[PDB]
Amino acid sequence: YNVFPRTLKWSKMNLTYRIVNYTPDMTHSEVEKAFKKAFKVWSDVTPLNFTRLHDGIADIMISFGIKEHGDFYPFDGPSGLLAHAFPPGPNYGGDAHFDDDETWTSSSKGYNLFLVAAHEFGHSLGLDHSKDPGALMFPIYTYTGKSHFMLPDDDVQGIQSLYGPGD
Amino acid sequence: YNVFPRTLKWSKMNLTYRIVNYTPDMTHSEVEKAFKKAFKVWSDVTPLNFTRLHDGIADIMISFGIKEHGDFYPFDGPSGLLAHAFPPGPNYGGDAHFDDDETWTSSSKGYNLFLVAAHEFGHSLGLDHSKDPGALMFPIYTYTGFMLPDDDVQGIQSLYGPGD
Amino acid sequence: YNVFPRTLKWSKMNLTYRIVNYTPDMTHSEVEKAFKKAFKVWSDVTPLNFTRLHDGIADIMISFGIKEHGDFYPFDGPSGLLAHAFPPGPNYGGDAHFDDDETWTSSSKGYNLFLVAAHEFGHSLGLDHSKDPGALMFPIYTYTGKSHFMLPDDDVQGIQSLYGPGD
Amino acid sequence: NVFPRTLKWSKMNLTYRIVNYTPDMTHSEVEKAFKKAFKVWSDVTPLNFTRLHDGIADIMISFGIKEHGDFYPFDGPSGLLAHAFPPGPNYGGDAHFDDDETWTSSSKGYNLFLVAAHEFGHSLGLDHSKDPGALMFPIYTYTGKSHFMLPDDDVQGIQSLYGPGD
Amino acid sequence: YNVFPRTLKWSKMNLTYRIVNYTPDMTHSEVEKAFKKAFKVWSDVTPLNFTRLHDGIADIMISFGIKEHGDFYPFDGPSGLLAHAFPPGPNYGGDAHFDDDETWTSSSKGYNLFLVAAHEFGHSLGLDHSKDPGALMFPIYTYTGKSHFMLPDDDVQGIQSLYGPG
Amino acid sequence: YNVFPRTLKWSKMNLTYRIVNYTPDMTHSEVEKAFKKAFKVWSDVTPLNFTRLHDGIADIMISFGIKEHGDFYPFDGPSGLLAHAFPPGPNYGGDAHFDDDETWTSSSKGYNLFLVAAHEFGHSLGLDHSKDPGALMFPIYTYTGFMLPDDDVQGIQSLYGPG
Amino acid sequence: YNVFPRTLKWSKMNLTYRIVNYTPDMTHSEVEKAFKKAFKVWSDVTPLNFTRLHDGIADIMISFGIKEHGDFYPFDGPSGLLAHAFPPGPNYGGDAHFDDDETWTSSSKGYNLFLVAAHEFGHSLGLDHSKDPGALMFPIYTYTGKSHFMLPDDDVQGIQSLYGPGD
Amino acid sequence: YNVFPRTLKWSKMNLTYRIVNYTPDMTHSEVEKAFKKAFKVWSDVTPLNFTRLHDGIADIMISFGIKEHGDFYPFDGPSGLLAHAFPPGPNYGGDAHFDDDETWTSSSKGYNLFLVAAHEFGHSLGLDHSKDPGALMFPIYTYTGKSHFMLPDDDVQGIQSLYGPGD
Ligand SMILES: Cn1c(=O)n(Cc2ccc(C(=O)O)cc2)c(=O)c2cc(C#CCc3ccccc3)ccc21
Ligand SMILES: Cn1c(=O)n(Cc2ccc(C(=O)O)cc2)c(=O)c2cc(C#CCc3ccccc3)ccc21
Ligand SMILES: Cn1c(=O)n(Cc2ccc(C(=O)O)cc2)c(=O)c2cc(C#CCc3ccccc3)ccc21
Ligand SMILES: Cn1c(=O)n(Cc2ccc(C(=O)O)cc2)c(=O)c2cc(C#CCc3ccccc3)ccc21
Ligand SMILES: Cn1c(=O)n(Cc2ccc(C(=O)O)cc2)c(=O)c2cc(C#CCc3ccccc3)ccc21
Ligand SMILES: Cn1c(=O)n(Cc2ccc(C(=O)O)cc2)c(=O)c2cc(C#CCc3ccccc3)ccc21
Ligand SMILES: Cn1c(=O)n(Cc2ccc(C(=O)O)cc2)c(=O)c2cc(C#CCc3ccccc3)ccc21
Ligand SMILES: Cn1c(=O)n(Cc2ccc(C(=O)O)cc2)c(=O)c2cc(C#CCc3ccccc3)ccc21
Ligand SMILES: [Ca+2]
Ligand SMILES: [Ca+2]
Ligand SMILES: [Ca+2]
Ligand SMILES: [Ca+2]
Ligand SMILES: [Ca+2]
Ligand SMILES: [Ca+2]
Ligand SMILES: [Ca+2]
Ligand SMILES: [Ca+2]
Ligand SMILES: [Ca+2]
Ligand SMILES: [Ca+2]
Ligand SMILES: [Ca+2]
Ligand SMILES: [Ca+2]
Ligand SMILES: [Ca+2]
Ligand SMILES: [Ca+2]
Ligand SMILES: [Ca+2]
Ligand SMILES: [Ca+2]
Ligand SMILES: [Ca+2]
Ligand SMILES: [Ca+2]
Ligand SMILES: [Ca+2]
Ligand SMILES: [Ca+2]
Ligand SMILES: [Ca+2]
Ligand SMILES: [Ca+2]
Ligand SMILES: [Ca+2]
Ligand SMILES: [Ca+2]
Ligand SMILES: [Zn+2]
Ligand SMILES: [Zn+2]
Ligand SMILES: [Zn+2]
Ligand SMILES: [Zn+2]
Ligand SMILES: [Zn+2]
Ligand SMILES: [Zn+2]
Ligand SMILES: [Zn+2]
Ligand SMILES: [Zn+2]
Ligand SMILES: [Zn+2]
Ligand SMILES: [Zn+2]
Ligand SMILES: [Zn+2]
Ligand SMILES: [Zn+2]
Ligand SMILES: [Zn+2]
Ligand SMILES: [Zn+2]
Ligand SMILES: [Zn+2]
Ligand SMILES: [Zn+2]
């Protein structure tokens, strides 16, 4: 027998991801680097392992799009909704979608891709929004100035309550 | 921080269902008898109860569709995915959809609607797949030569209790 | 790491079979009778039970075909290979295929369908060949001799090891 | 006399045959790649691999694109790179490589030696590993050559089946 | 004259419980599930019902501890005493303590927490030890079986002789 | 006065067993198969039923040891004493120990594991040695090139019935 | 021969600790992280080395309890007495008990476990209460906003007066 | 004439071992490999020489056992005591016993057999516990990530102070 899992989490540590397409706003390299760092934010404090896929179906499918892009959450043009991700689960579960009507950056201009990605992947991995205004999983985008990124305590605690700490 | 809390069991015991539409492959009466028996399997071995609504919103919405049918988990034509249901909860929770690109029957021909329904309803109530090859809740369809397998009676008595 | 775990035993006792199509050389009735007896031989010494389905998928799917007939284990025309069956488990598991470039009979002519099916069905259940020249499971086809079929002791003990004895 | 309990070879002496060759490498590069990939497994087991030039070998190696004679057609550049069948008769043990890939002796495209050593793990009865550092992990990763030492998880796996070498 | 009253059986069918602290051996949810299940064993066959408090004094206070842990009934390290519970009644009465020098599990390893907790709650509810070797209330821990816990007949009868049937 | 309790039979027909450790002489699979076979011998002619536990205390704990190995019934090195088991009952009751100074095999060589474990499990279930030279429960090991002899079928059915 | 040491202090630098049980109020990881940090405070300014045991008897046995928990210092329900620890020595010496009628947190709410454990581990190591209101060893709890934690000078001086500086 | 030696040490460089029995937890090969590696740790820095016996009485008799297993040191189920070894001498001297209520592994899961074995064979050769927390002979198990095994200097000195350096 088997009752459904008790919280939306991944029942495995090895996850894969795939950059289906790219934004016109940043170089391919910049985008790969942002996504890589965004995943490292979570793998650094957990036993989670992220392997990149070039083709095929990955657990976490990453795509850029505008307006209607193949689900019940169409984007809205510049500003407003920036991106979204589905919680752990089959098919669409874990997938992260980015509104390519935003201006995506590696800087303080427009919206920082690394930042929104890191936040969205919190969702992909089982985290909902935080009520702590300093948390990465706080609902509203904040850029606090480019520095060494250290995952806030609240987010470390949240992801650790699901997957444990890293070795 | 917050997680997503989960519904793993219907918080209540007077569950409702609605057959939204019907397959070409069987009469209305044949389909209704199949769904009724699929619910009887589970409600015999639990305190759960199932009431059918003809109109309106019910806990368990049953429907027949092909391909993309409004949930972004599309079906795939004949063979392959046979059906799917959603775990317990609000809205889409509990709903069961059958691929109407299969031939549904009351026998060994095509796929047996009672059998697949009985299985999908397992999901609707809190159950996931079983590792035991003889379980109704096994991932793979097999029509054997109906008493609910002991593995499934465990599965479901472990969420709702024996009843009575 | 992982291997492939195997099934060398139908985990259940109420097995189904289906005769998908028929040979030109015998009547439907003679064919069904040949298959019945081939199953009776195994189910007389074990707790195994066999049920015939007329449509749908059965554990043991029985079919007649020639040359490349849909598995990539093609047949070879008259003589040589006579039939084949797959070991227990899923899908193609348990299925038995007979070369219809053979002449199937219920006598000593051509190849006796009961005999070859009986031998094939051992595979479907969990037996490989023996080196006992008298056994039913023995690579080469020989038509004896005896004119009432009694299952040879090798095969009797062979299958009783996997499934247990009659009653 | 029941069926074996794992898909494994019931004999240590195995033969293989390179049926055809890729355009991307010289015959010698390919021979050396396959030779090395077998040597990965024979160095830690009592298994012995003997090349056949023609005829039927236990492990039949071929390059193809799209439909090539089984139920697993290749898909063009990228995606599926190759596959092998577990031990057994006929197609059992056979390894197929998608020649819509760019096969290399290097870090460019896909390394033939590396993919082959992975597929030959399957030909010998190993399924996928869940250790990200193992040869049998499902996803291709080239880590920079370097002397190849078979990761501990793949050593354990293959020896669980065939025992250690002399 | 006067005796000590009671009747070490609850005079009230509605009981509360509190998990005071947690063992290192299992996750919070596993512990909560194991105790939930152990209560349900008893509340399925009686008019008893159990409600969980997160704070305060409850009827059945549940804790893990080792050695001297506050009742002058010290635990003894690995093996031996696994846990104890006090007969029904105020204060220490009805409380269940679990020896955290045992390994607690939701399987056959160490000691199954649910299984011991079910036995212990039997004491909490008024049952002493049974001479029926097959009963939950038999003094000696034995892990069958037998998957899918159906309360043995002796314990069904035993508890119902105090509280009656459901 | 009081005596002690009866070591007659497992008051429950459903029993558990654990293979605590393994002999060098055979593989894990070969050993599991031998014990599975040895339990099947008895469970086919009774309503007894056997479940394998991979951890914890099981009714029948099975181990390989040599010389003195924790019960004060030490083994003797090669040959002679081959193994022993304890009459039904709690703790050590039902347990079977095998002398790992013997060579264990799935053949005529050394000592056939299945055959010795079938005999020992007969003790785990309440049978003593038989005076019937052809029985499994005869004291003296003999490998005769498997249907459970009549004397042992009667023996175990006179405790647990035919099932 | 030997005299009893002049201060209740450990005669070795390698000390072990065991977390006997856990609070309901925080995840296992949060509790481990808090004790580990609390010990790090003292090990960072001394040659003290703290080793975690999972079972058996450690020098510093840590448990959560309520009211009577097996010594002459029963707790008192919520608030009031939060925790206590024994000075160095055999048996109960070095042990730290925490009152589980408190609400233990990894934040500014309730009582911060790391903060209280660090103070109590000071007692475990031979420090008594300080008269310096800015000292961790000041008797009265005070939380001063999640910063990088720097052990105050008084506490540094107190523990060094016993064990000296490390490396 | 002769006096008993001044430490528990082997008065010969040729030592034999026998693996009496095996854990369910690992393959026969994984266990033999783990004990071989364990002995190499010590032979690599000494003149000591290790020969495996398959049958008979060896100097170092190795077994897996649970609870009472034939000496005055019964094991205690999962965790706690992992294994013990006797110091050099006749009979039980040098023998290593492993608690088979542990989960023995060839990785970082449960307890690593090679690691516990190497520690325990230190005892078998005449080392007691170190006070160095980074030493193999430190009393408490610690797995420091999988890397090439290089015996700490404290242990090299201990074993060399008994047997000298390998020539
Ligand atoms: C720790 N931390 C930082 O160091 N920095 C600076 C920073 C460092 C490095 C880079 C870079 O490598 O490009 C960029 C920015 C943040 O900006 C920040 C931001 C949030 C948030 C939120 C809320 C939210 C974000 C996104 C979407 C929705 C909500 C949480 C923590 C931090
Ligand atoms: C106990 N049992 C049976 O008696 N029969 C025969 C049977 C009896 C009565 C009717 C009828 O009233 O029309 C039909 C068929 C099954 O076929 C069967 C099948 C499975 C399964 C599974 C796995 C799975 C099923 C469906 C979907 C996915 C997976 C479990 C138990 C049984
Ligand atoms: C016991 N037995 C017989 O009594 N007879 C006579 C016989 C009796 C009854 C009928 C009938 O009812 O139609 C036919 C033939 C055999 O011929 C025979 C033959 C083999 C074989 C083999 C080897 C092999 C290899 C490959 C395929 C099939 C068989 C094994 C046993 C026996
Ligand atoms: C030990 N090891 C290495 O040293 N190197 C470097 C390396 C050495 C020598 C050559 C050469 O002679 O040409 C090339 C590369 C690897 O790249 C590697 C890679 C994997 C894998 C996997 C997973 C997977 C591979 C292929 C297909 C699918 C999955 C496991 C172990 C190692
Ligand atoms: C009916 N029953 C079982 O099905 N099983 C198996 C079992 C099923 C399900 C779970 C689970 O879901 O976690 C666990 C175990 C028992 O083990 C058992 C055990 C005792 C006893 C006693 C004596 C004693 C003494 C002291 C403490 C505990 C028990 C009575 C009845 C049963
Ligand atoms: C019926 N039976 C046999 O068929 N065979 C042959 C045999 C068949 C199959 C296998 C196998 O599957 O590996 C092995 C051996 C015996 O050897 C035998 C032996 C005893 C005895 C005793 C006395 C004693 C044995 C052990 C320990 C103490 C005393 C009783 C009955 C039988
Ligand atoms: C240096 N220091 C701080 O930086 N902070 C802030 C702080 C930093 C990090 C965390 C954290 O990681 O969660 C929390 C709080 C303190 O609050 C503090 C508090 C006391 C005290 C006392 C007195 C007493 C405490 C406890 C019990 C009894 C008495 C001494 C020093 C400090
Ligand atoms: C040098 N060294 C390491 O490199 N590694 C890593 C390591 C390398 C290779 C393998 C492997 O092949 O499986 C495993 C682990 C250790 O873990 C370690 C551990 C201790 C200790 C202690 C204390 C104690 C151990 C065992 C029992 C009791 C006490 C001392 C030194 C080292
Ligand atoms: Ca996905
Ligand atoms: Ca937008
Ligand atoms: Ca854009
Ligand atoms: Ca619904
Ligand atoms: Ca379909
Ligand atoms: Ca249809
Ligand atoms: Ca089939
Ligand atoms: Ca032919
Ligand atoms: Ca024909
Ligand atoms: Ca082949
Ligand atoms: Ca491809
Ligand atoms: Ca190519
Ligand atoms: Ca109470
Ligand atoms: Ca105890
Ligand atoms: Ca514990
Ligand atoms: Ca026992
Ligand atoms: Ca002997
Ligand atoms: Ca032996
Ligand atoms: Ca208090
Ligand atoms: Ca202490
Ligand atoms: Ca608390
Ligand atoms: Ca232990
Ligand atoms: Ca010795
Ligand atoms: Ca073990
Ligand atoms: Zn979207
Ligand atoms: Zn968000
Ligand atoms: Zn649908
Ligand atoms: Zn399903
Ligand atoms: Zn075929
Ligand atoms: Zn055949
Ligand atoms: Zn192919
Ligand atoms: Zn692969
Ligand atoms: Zn107590
Ligand atoms: Zn009790
Ligand atoms: Zn013994
Ligand atoms: Zn005997
Ligand atoms: Zn205290
Ligand atoms: Zn204080
Ligand atoms: Zn010992
Ligand atoms: Zn030690």
XYZ file of C-alpha atoms in Angstrom, chain G residues 14 16 49 51 53 55, chain H residues 79-80 131 133 138 140:
12
model
C 38.163 16.530 24.341
C 31.636 14.663 24.083
C 37.029 20.162 21.252
C 32.532 15.580 19.790
C 27.756 11.045 20.429
C 24.073 6.884 21.995
C 23.890 1.872 17.234
C 25.839 2.077 20.553
C 43.294 11.477 22.581
C 40.379 13.770 17.636
C 40.039 8.124 18.503
C 34.285 7.851 18.369
